[PDB]
């Protein structure tokens, strides 16, 4: 009710505060790391209270305060769409961002702009969350473009590096090609539906959104790595480990499929775009996974694991399961970020290196990261009772059950096999047992804050897989019986 109206937006306000505190310039640049880490932590806590309020009363909401224009038939207001989708997605989002902020504090400890880096993740996640709850397509595109451009800057964080800025250009190029489809979609809506509010368009029940669905599919293929518009993520993890593990793992590369989830009521009306999304989500799980089969870099393999799994929720929205894909992104933020956390940990410990060659038999000297990496690998390969069980496991039995494209069906089990393959590739390369590294042994996770952040995401990757799967209201297709094979 009223508290659900207030705190759901105070969650955003509390994170707006540190940013203008930064614009005050009175803040001490060394205290600002802990400042914004603490602020994202509280914002996560204050984001749970709307979550259990909704869980209590199963109610959605949209807030439309003071408007911006009133042009003829268009009243562009600050329309935040914090429904079950948004209020259930955000707490995991701020939890992941807080854990990775502690991780970045530990990792980025030798950079003059550490506070600048952290506030950069802060602004990125602000536009992310406003995109999450954005009823009007104008705020939807505000979040879209904001997360895209701030991704671009975060990849270009190492502006001295030629490859960094080049990859930022590639990422903005592909994201912007997707933004072309976004522009086509919003143009169609403002011509036909002459309004921006998502609820308004679903209300109109335009059962023939051919051009809208095409535009949203293209935008998703842009911001969610899919064939043709996939390689910008292979360019994107060139940035720092914190951004590679937060943005380029489970926060803004999921933005496209997330947008399709927000536009599901229009999506389910047409079934051809469902088949095309099946094809795209299969073909990305092909290309990225087979390229990761033999990749000599730990960042790359997990990045292609990301992109393939994003194509997996693309398949999920293509078999008329928006909410299954929504639970998938929800536990995706936990687990995939968790494995990228392990990757950053080994990188920092193993002489700031990422290649699967020249490992030190890490398991002997990298135990905590070893266990975290093994359970994350089992999770992305559908570990029962883990995040994987209420994830790709569910989506695989759904695609085997639902009337789906054949080649997509065989392709997604090939993708699961490859998901096992490279996940164990990092296992038998990093922690194999044959030391290969500089004579000075630096592989050691002795930093207490690193342990705290890693275990903070670790408990979610163990628990939060099922601490949300049965708690949620019954929302998906409950296919109980099915052939044993």
């Amino acid at each position: 009710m009223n508290p659900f109206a207030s705190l759901t937006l105070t969650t955003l306000i509390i994170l707006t505060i540190p940013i203008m505190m930064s614009n005050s310039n009175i803040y001490k640049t060394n205290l600002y790391p802990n400042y914004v880490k603490t602020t994202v932590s509280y914002a996560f806590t204050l984001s749970l209270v709307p979550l259990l309020m909704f869980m209590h009363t199963g109610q959605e909401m949209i807030i439309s305060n003071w408007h911006w224009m009133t042009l003829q038939t268009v009243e562009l207001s600050l329309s935040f769409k914090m429904d079950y989708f948004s209020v259930m997605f955000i707490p995991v989002a701020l939890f992941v961002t807080w854990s990775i902020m502690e991780f970045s504090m530990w990792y980025m400890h030798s950079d003059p702009f550490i506070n600048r880096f952290f506030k950069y993740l802060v602004l990125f996640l602000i536009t992310m969350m406003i995109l999450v709850t954005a009823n009007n397509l104008f705020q939807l595109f505000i979040g879209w473009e904001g997360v895209g451009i701030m991704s671009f800057l975060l990849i270009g964080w190492w502006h001295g590096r030629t490859d960094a800025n080049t990859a930022a250009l590639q990422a903005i190029l592909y994201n912007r090609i997707g933004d072309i489809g976004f522009v086509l979609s919003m143009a169609w809506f403002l011509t036909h539906s002459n309004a921006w509010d998502l609820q308004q368009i679903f209300m109109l029940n335009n059962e023939c959104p051919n051009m809208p669905l095409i535009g949203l599919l293209l935008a998703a293929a842009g911001k969610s790595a899919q064939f043709g518009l996939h390689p910008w993520l292979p360019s994107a993890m060139e940035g720092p480990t914190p951004v590679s593990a937060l943005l380029h793992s489970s926060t803004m590369v999921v933005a496209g499929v997330f947008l399709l989830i927000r536009f599901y009521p229009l999506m389910e009306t047409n079934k051809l775009v469902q088949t095309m999304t099946l094809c795209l989500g299969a073909i990305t799980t092909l290309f990225t996974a087979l390229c990761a089969i033999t990749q000599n870099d730990i960042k790359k393999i997990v990045a292609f694991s990301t992109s393939s799994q994003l194509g997996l929720m693309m398949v999920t929205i293509g078999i008329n399961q928006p909410h299954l894909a929504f639970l998938h992104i929800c536990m995706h933020a936990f687990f995939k970020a968790m494995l990228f956390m392990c990757s950053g940990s080994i990188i920092h410990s193993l002489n700031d290196e990422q290649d699967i060659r020249k490992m030190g038999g890490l398991y002997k000297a990298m135990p905590f990261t070893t266990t975290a990496l093994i359970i994350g690998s089992l999770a992305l390969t559908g570990m029962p009772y883990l995040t994987g069980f209420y994830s790709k496991d569910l989506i695989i039995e759904a695609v085997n059950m639902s009337y789906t494209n054949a080649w997509a069906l065989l392709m997604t089990l090939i993708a699961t096999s490859l998901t096992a393959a490279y996940s164990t590739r990092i296992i038998f390369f990093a922690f194999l047992g044959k030391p290969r590294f500089p004579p000075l042994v630096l592989i050691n996770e002795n930093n207490p804050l690193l342990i705290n952040s890693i275990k903070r995401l670790l408990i979610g990757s163990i628990f939060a897989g099922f601490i949300i799967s049965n708690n949620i209201p019954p929302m998906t297709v409950p296919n109980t019986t099915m052939p044993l094979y």
Binding site: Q72, T73, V74, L190, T191, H192, S193, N194, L204
Partner: protein, 64 residues
């Protein structure tokens, strides 16, 4: 600044209207021009003869 000049101002004084130059210059000076003009007028007349009797729908498109 040799390359700057030879990329900005040296072009015309050394430019000669060769048959190839005139050919491809006219090619993309009236090919994309008239081609976009053609496709655009094509769709515009398409809606023109789809609206005079009422085939095309204008139900919710008031905010034209």
């Amino acid at each position: 600044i040799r390359w700057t000049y030879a990329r900005s101002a040296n072009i015309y004084p050394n430019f000669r209207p060769t048959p190839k130059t005139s050919l491809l210059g006219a090619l993309f000076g009236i090919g994309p021009l008239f081609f976009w003009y053609y496709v655009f007028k094509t769709d515009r007349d398409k809606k023109e003869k789809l609206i005079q009797e009422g085939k095309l729908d204008q139900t919710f498109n008031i905010s034209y």
